[PDB]
Paper text:
Here, we conduct a comprehensive functional analysis of the Antibiotic_NAT family of aminoglycoside acetyltransferases. AG resistance is primarily conferred by three classes of aminoglycoside-modifying enzymes (AMEs): phosphotransferases (APHs), nucleotidylyltransferases (ANTs), and acetyltransferases (AACs). AMEs permanently alter the AG substrate, preventing them from binding to their target, the A-site of the 16S rRNA in the bacterial ribosome. The fold typical of the Antibiotic_NAT family is evident in all structures, composed of 13 α-helices and 8 β-strands, and determined structures superpose with pairwise RMSD’s 0.8–1.0 Å between 197 to 266 matching Cα atoms.
The meta-[name] adopts a dimeric structure with a buried surface of ~900 Å2 per subunit. This enzyme also forms a dimer in solution according to the size exclusion chromatography (not shown). Similar sequence signatures (residues Thr165-Glu171 in meta-[name]) were identified in all analyzed members of this family, with His and Glu (His168 and Glu171 in meta-[name]) along with two glycine residues (Gly122 and Gly158 in metaAAC0038), completely conserved. This motif’s threonine (Thr165 in meta-[name]) is also conserved in all but one of the analyzed sequences where it is substituted by a chemically similar serine.
Author numbering:
A (entry chain A): 4 to 262
B (entry chain B): 3 to 262
The structure:
């Protein structure tokens, strides 16, 4: 069947979205199916279910492709990171670009961990995003747990749950990989190369698989605290950010104590 | 097999004919340009560097409607009205018009079928007072482009996608000019109100002509030496004065209707 802004609203209410919720969404918009007014009907329906006080987020990142790090003669030609002009990454899909390009949207300043938010608390999730360790508490992810937010996997593969990288920052497990890279950002309004360091989110900890987030999400849904539903034609899940992070921290700490 | 930079694209745009201050309507196929360092925005950034802050880059936006609005009924109330701020550009000619519209500081026309995204110094002038009915006539950024003696750059896109020539279809005097009538939801007094539109049909060539007959008119105009070709990145491009090819397409169409 075709999905409308009214139809998508009922599908989002059924899966467990309410007024005032702040939900981080990673979406594979192709699985949703035919929509009348395009994929904007999804975002418009969400802002109707959660209201103007609710907030919708999306993992923006940016198109850099690691050709900046050690391809000199590119350095003077790589544009600086601008949280107003830098396009979001196309790895997980068009959904982060849909939020950012929507009028009235905002975008945090940490290049690797940048989130595109829109809604009443969009000014709060994007503000004061730490550059180094951009997945820690001083990030939109940590504020999503602090605000008891939700996460909706709109047909996207479950291993793409970026929120669980915030659990990697908190989990006490031995030998985390410290990733030090150099990226160009805007310092005093001009392009300046800053040295960054964070926990390796491009590769899992030594031992686990690249998609070990998928097993953590499937284990959490087995508890019943999560909800599974369909939005249009895309089978989706909806989990609380505060519980699945604490569930993943215990998952990682339990796995790390085997030393 | 070379890569293009913001500085590299600027020097390529200067050789094709782009200069300071002038306006340029761009229909582009960004894949033909090849690898670019800072993404496709380097193309738009390079133009605004060559044309200066007073120049204006325009793009044919239209909007996503897919003609499912046409007569599919009771799907009528579910169609969001046309918003020159939130309705996205059609994706059939490429990402370029949406690249301009989503760029900060850009504006967008008000005629749904013929809407145009513009950014630059005179972005306010080109997008203003765009007539809903006959959105390709003299009261459109196409007519304002001819008035300001702008240019048209075919950045890898096929020459039959030069939208400016639709403005010449409106000006040319040839018999049996088809008329397209349709209704689409727009914004009247801040609310969605359906409106019947009347315009010269642009989705089909007039009187059994080739669907790509725009490409021939540009190819014949380029034979006069009045335009200029040149590679921008790795894409063969065509820069053409806006006023001269409209006068060329008018005489081409008027003499064609006479010969019939």
């Amino acid at each position: 069947r075709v999905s409308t802004r009214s139809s998508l609203a009922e599908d989002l209410r059924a899966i467990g979205l309410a007024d005032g919720d702040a939900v981080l969404v990673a979406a594979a918009l192709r699985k949703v199916g035919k929509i009348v007014g395009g994929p904007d009907d999804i975002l418009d329906a969400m802002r109707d279910v959660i209201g103007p006080a609710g907030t919708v987020l999306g993992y923006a990142d940016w198109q850099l492709e690691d050709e900046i790090r050690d391809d000199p003669a590119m350095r003077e030609h790589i544009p600086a990171f601008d949280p107003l002009r830098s396009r979001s990454i196309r790895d997980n899909g068009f959904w982060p670009e849909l939020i950012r390009t929507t009028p009235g949207a905002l975008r945090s300043a940490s290049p690797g961990a940048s989130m595109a938010a829109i809604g009443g608390e969009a000014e709060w999730f994007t503000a004061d995003h730490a550059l180094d360790y951009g997945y820690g508490p001083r990030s939109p992810l940590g504020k999503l747990v602090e605000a008891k937010g939700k996460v909706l996997m709109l047909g996207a593969p479950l291993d793409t749950m970026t929120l669980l990288h915030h659990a990697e920052h908190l989990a006490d497990f031995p030998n985390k990989r410290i990733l030090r890279y150099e990226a160009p950002i805007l310092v005093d309004g001009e392009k300046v190369w800053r040295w960054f360091e964070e926990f390796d989110t491009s590769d899992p900890p030594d031992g686990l698989a690249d998609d070990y987030f998928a097993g953590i999400v499937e284990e959490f849904l087995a508890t019943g605290r999560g909800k599974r539903g369909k939005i249009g034609e895309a089978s989706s899940v909806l989990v609380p950010a505060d519980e699945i992070v604490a569930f993943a921290v215990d998952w990682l700490e339990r796995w790390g104590r085997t030393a």
